[PDB]
Each structure stands twice: as structure tokens, then as C-alpha cells.
Amino acid sequence: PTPVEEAQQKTIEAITKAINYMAKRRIGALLTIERDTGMGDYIETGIPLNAKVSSELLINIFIPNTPLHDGAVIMKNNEIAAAACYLPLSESPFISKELGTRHRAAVGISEVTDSLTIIVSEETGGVSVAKNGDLHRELTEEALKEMLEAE
Amino acid sequence: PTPVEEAQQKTIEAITKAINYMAKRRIGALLTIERDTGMGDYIETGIPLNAKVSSELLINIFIPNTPLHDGAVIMKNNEIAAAACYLPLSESPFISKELGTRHRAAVGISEVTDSLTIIVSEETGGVSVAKNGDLHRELTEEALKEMLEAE
Ligand SMILES: C[C@H](O)c1ccc([N+](=O)[O-])cc1
Ligand SMILES: [Mg+2]
Numbered sequence: 001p002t003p004v005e006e007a008q009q010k011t012i013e014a015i016t017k018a019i020n021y022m023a024k025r026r027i028g029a030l031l032t033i034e035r036d037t038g039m040g041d042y043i044e045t046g047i048p049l050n051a052k053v054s055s056e057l058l059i060n061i062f063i064p065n066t067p068l069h070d071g072a073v074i075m076k077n078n079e080i081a082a083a084a085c086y087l088p089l090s091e092s093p094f095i096s097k098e099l100g101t102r103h104r105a106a107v108g109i110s111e112v113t114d115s116l117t118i119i120v121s122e123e124t125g126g127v128s129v130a131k132n133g134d135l136h137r138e139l140t141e142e143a144l145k146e147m148l149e150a151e
Numbered sequence: 152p153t154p155v156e157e158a159q160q161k162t163i164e165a166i167t168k169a170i171n172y173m174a175k176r177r178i179g180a181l182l183t184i185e186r187d188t189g190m191g192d193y194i195e196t197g198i199p200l201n202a203k204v205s206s207e208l209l210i211n212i213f214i215p216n217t218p219l220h221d222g223a224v225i226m227k228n229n230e231i232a233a234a235a236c237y238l239p240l241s242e243s244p245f246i247s248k249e250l251g252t253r254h255r256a257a258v259g260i261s262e263v264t265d266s267l268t269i270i271v272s273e274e275t276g277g278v279s280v281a282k283n284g285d286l287h288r289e290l291t292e293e294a295l296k297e298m299l300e301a302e
Contacts, residue, residue: 051202
């Protein structure tokens, strides 16, 4: 296991712990992981953090009615690059009509990048992932873990 | 002004905007600024961030009942080094008796370092600063600004 691989495992553990905490409490969240398509244009719309990842910071960011909670967190590798970021809204007809702006923003960025976006619904606590224009809903903890390890 | 001078003033504005936000809402806070005495031993007790300063991130860290709100933020080299850090509690018999652990921790670190620590009381929203073993209480925004500019 190289340092790079161990660091990736720590980041996935941090992300999965934060998502699970937020799902249980119905804390809405929108977390985009940059991949090979650069997302600088969207990172620059938010508040710069350039912070080391932790489950604790991810949770603190999304607490309702706080300065950082509204908009997307964008991660670059093992860092939280910015919070409260703008993402474009998808007009796909395959987004469940009951879903709100977080899910439409997630699918939107997924249509113009190869990023992976995780959404927690503030209505149900359900966890979904947007990738390549598709939204995959109602994920188990195990399924989320898988998708991140494969990414 | 020089890039170093403009960066210092931005940081002072970010700090004062956050302190004022938390004073109004009586959100307890503990923010230590490292000076010439290195504080690595204390930084290592918290959650690593190495994040850029913003008023928004400072506010989000100290939201009550969150992972990061318990303990001190330590700033170093114009970044937020870590949150939820341990600081030593003063045994000084000359701290106002109505004050609790946040203020004793601020005075305590100020007895063994040249650091400047800002405290917001969760009981009153009063703002105070610890330096050289003394606590300066009931500060206005202008008074805090002057201390930060003097530092
Ligand atoms: C930022 C500054 O220290 C300060 C801001 C606001 C208050 N107050 O509402 O009383 C006190 C002190
Ligand atoms: Mg299903």
C-alpha cells in the first residue's frame, strides 16, 4: 500500500463517515469530487478553504442555517477546495420530480464533467450519487463505499 | 500596501466579522493566534485543517453541538492550522470567578506562550483577549481590532 493509496483510503473513510452522520440526521449535503475534468471555474464561485479532509469538517460545513451550508463542497484529491459553490442545474427529465435543487445541481455538474457527486436529501435522509448525467438513488452505506473505492 | 500587509488586514477583518457574529448570538469560541512561541504540541491535539481563513469557516467551526466546536482553533502563518485543540487550564487565582473553562484555557496558553487568544463567552457574548497571563475583558470591536493591529 503506497502513501497515495493509504491517503485515498483515509479520504473515503472521512467522506463515508460524514455522509452517514448527515443521512441519519436529515442534514442536506452536496459534495462533488473532482476527477480528471478540472472544476476550477466552479471552485472559484465558492468560499476558498483548501483544507485537509476530515469527517468533522465535512459535517460542520453542512449544518443547516450556517454560512457554508448552502451550495456545493468541491473536493480535489484529499482536500476540501471550497464550499458554498455554484453548480449548473440539470434539465434532465430523469430527475425525480419531487427532488430539489441539490440533486439538480449534482446531475448538472455530472453532465459536463467526469466528477462524482454525493447528495444527502434533507427531506428523507436518502443518499444518492450523480455521475455521467445519471442519478443513482437510495444507496446503502455499502453501495456508497463501493462506488467511491471504484472511483 | 504590500501583499503581506493586505493579507494581514484581510485576516483581521475575517476574524472580527466572525467574532461579532458569535458575540451577537452568544456562541462560545476560543481562537488562539500563534506568534513567536511555537505551538505545534497543541496544534497536534486537534483536528488538522490548514485551511484559508474566512469569517464563514470560523463561524461554521464554532456552531454549538458540532464536531469541531469543542476546544480551540489555532491559527499559524495566516491559516487555520487545527480546530478542537487542547489548551492548558490556568490555575491563576486572579481570573474573574464567574468565568469558566474556555477563559481559563485562554489564560493558560497565554502564560506559557506569547500567543494572543480571543474568547467569546457563551453566557454573555462578551469578547475578551488573553495575553501574557492576563485577561482583557468586555472589549468592543474597535478595541479588539486595535489589539490585533498591535500584535
Ligand atoms: C468583534 C468585537 O469584539 C465585538 C463585537 C460585538 C460585540 N457585542 O455585540 O457586544 C462585542 C465585541
Ligand atoms: Mg434503488
